[PDB]
């Protein structure tokens, strides 16, 4: 189905409760005469920006919140206008997840985090550490079984291990994310990916394992453990495997750190049905009955709606989900997230198959997750700081009573210097490549002259703190 005035088309991932969502859509049609169609196209999160402009998107797209800053940036999402009374019904932190440049750009639905799912009959006591898995697998392989299978094709599933002992996406520097500070190739990220790679090398896992292979393997009792989200529980219910949902194993003593997603629903900017979409989301879906219809099909996790979450919180599987979430981090929603995920996807696939070493693979991912101010731009910014410096010199211009004079040195404007003192200036904001927490230094001599380099006519200046992160 394609967009038409007076109908709704909804896209949601094929792993979620699309049948349940379809039932909410039919209730809406029964009440209003408005047809609601639910589809689950493959790679819908990649398809959406490619086809919205051409007229082939849906009215409403469901995805975790991390993709939505990119869509908003690209002008593909309508700002949503829920009143304060409606906002009060959902948890504050869920609204935060769907805020982009101070505007709400999606309705939050549910909070998702990966957990360790294990087969109680094969594994009464699941491992508390990643390190004990190899010996557990050797033991299980002897009984014609394996310890663990999970999706290796999507970095979302391997991220909790990469992040456990120090990998991170973007550094959160109070207020906001620093896109120049990526934590994909530090020591902890290498340690975590190396462990994954060694499991494969030692034949405790197969580099080609994907979602459906891991799910079939667990749901047929072939493997003792899997790693998956709440949506996976109803297929395990159908399978009648005796399963539990628990905290992810630790790596090097540190909790596994899942990236936590808020399943959200955005409205297509190209839709002529924005009001109908709002009405369906607020009055049909985001109700106890609406969410229960979906949850009954495939579990949502911990829902944004407080009234229904209060009932779901009682489920020990939801408790485990929340414990794992609490140990993880809510994903950024910034436009850069898709570049990050593509880079980490490539790294893990490449390292797992031996195409690259862990070192080669993560170095490249760092380069790509962080890959713009031009030189021409930078030159203008310097010219601006220079003019600002000259305007400053206009107005400005016994023992240790004569200061060094302010000057421009082609990078920084130096202020008045007290004679005999070191003068510190913050590494300037307008230099993109600088370390902005650092200082540059000059020395003002006792006579009020800036200190010169011995054997030369140049002024002594130390910019080593500024260029700290340029190797």
């Amino acid at each position: 189905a394609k967009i038409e005035e007076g109908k709704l088309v909804i896209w949601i991932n094929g792993d979620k409760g699309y049948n349940g969502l379809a039932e909410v859509g039919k209730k809406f049609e029964k009440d209003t005469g408005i047809k609601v169609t639910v589809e689950h196209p493959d790679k819908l999160e990649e398809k959406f920006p490619q086809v919205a402009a051409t007229g082939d998107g849906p009215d409403i797209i469901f995805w975790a919140h991390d993709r939505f800053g990119g869509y908003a940036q690209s002008g593909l999402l309508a700002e949503i206008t829920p009143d304060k009374a409606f906002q009060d019904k959902l948890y504050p932190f869920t609204w935060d997840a769907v805020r982009y440049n101070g505007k709400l750009i999606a309705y939050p639905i549910a909070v998702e985090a990966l957990s360790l799912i294990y087969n109680k009959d094969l594994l009464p006591n699941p491992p508390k550490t990643w390190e004990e898995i190899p010996a557990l697998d050797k033991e299980l392989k002897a009984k014609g079984k394996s310890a663990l299978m999970f999706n290796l094709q999507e970095p979302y599933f391997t991220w909790p291990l990469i992040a456990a002992d120090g990998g991170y996406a973007f550094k959160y520097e109070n207020g906001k994310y620093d896109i120049k500070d990526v934590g994909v190739d530090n020591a902890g990220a290498k340690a975590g990916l190396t462990f994954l790679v060694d499991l494969i090398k030692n034949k405790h896992m197969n580099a080609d394992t994907d979602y459906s292979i891991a799910e079939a393997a667990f749901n047929k009792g072939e493997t003792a453990m899997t790693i998956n989200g709440p949506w996976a529980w109803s297929n395990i219910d159908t399978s009648k495997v005796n399963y539990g949902v628990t905290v992810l194993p630790t790596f090097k003593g540190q909790p596994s750190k899942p990236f936590v997603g808020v399943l959200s629903a955005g409205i297509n900017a190209a839709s002529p049905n924005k009001e109908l979409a709002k009405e369906f989301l607020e009055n049909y879906l985001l109700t106890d009955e609406g969410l229960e219809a979906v949850n009954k099909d495939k579990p949502l996790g911990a829902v944004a709606l407080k009234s229904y979450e209060e009932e779901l919180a009682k489920d020990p599987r939801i408790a485990a989900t929340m414990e794992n979430a609490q140990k993880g981090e809510i994903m950024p929603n910034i436009p850069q997230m898709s570049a990050f995920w593509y880079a980490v996807r490539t790294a893990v696939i490449n390292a797992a198959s031996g195409r690259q070493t862990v070192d080669e693979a993560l170095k490249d991912a760092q380069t790509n997750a962080a890959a713009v101010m031009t030189k021409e731009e930078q030159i203008f910014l310097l010219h601006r700081a220079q003019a600002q410096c000259e305007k400053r010199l206009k107005e400005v211009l016994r023992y240790r009573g004569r200061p060094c004079l302010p000057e421009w040195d082609h990078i920084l404007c130096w202020p008045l210097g007290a004679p005999g003192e070191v003068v510190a200036v913050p590494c300037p904001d307008y230099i993109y490549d600088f370390n902005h927490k650092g200082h540059a230094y000059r020395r003002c001599d006792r006579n009020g002259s800036w200190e010169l380099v011995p054997g030369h006519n140049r002024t002594w200046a130390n910019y080593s703190e500024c260029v700290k992160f340029l190797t």
């Binding site: 713009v372 490549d433 230094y441 910019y463």
Partner: peptide
Amino acid sequence: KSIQDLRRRFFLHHLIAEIHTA
């Protein structure tokens, strides 16, 4: 990689080399 980073960073390296005298 990206050529704009290369040009920008090379430009800055050149400028720094003259001025940073420590």
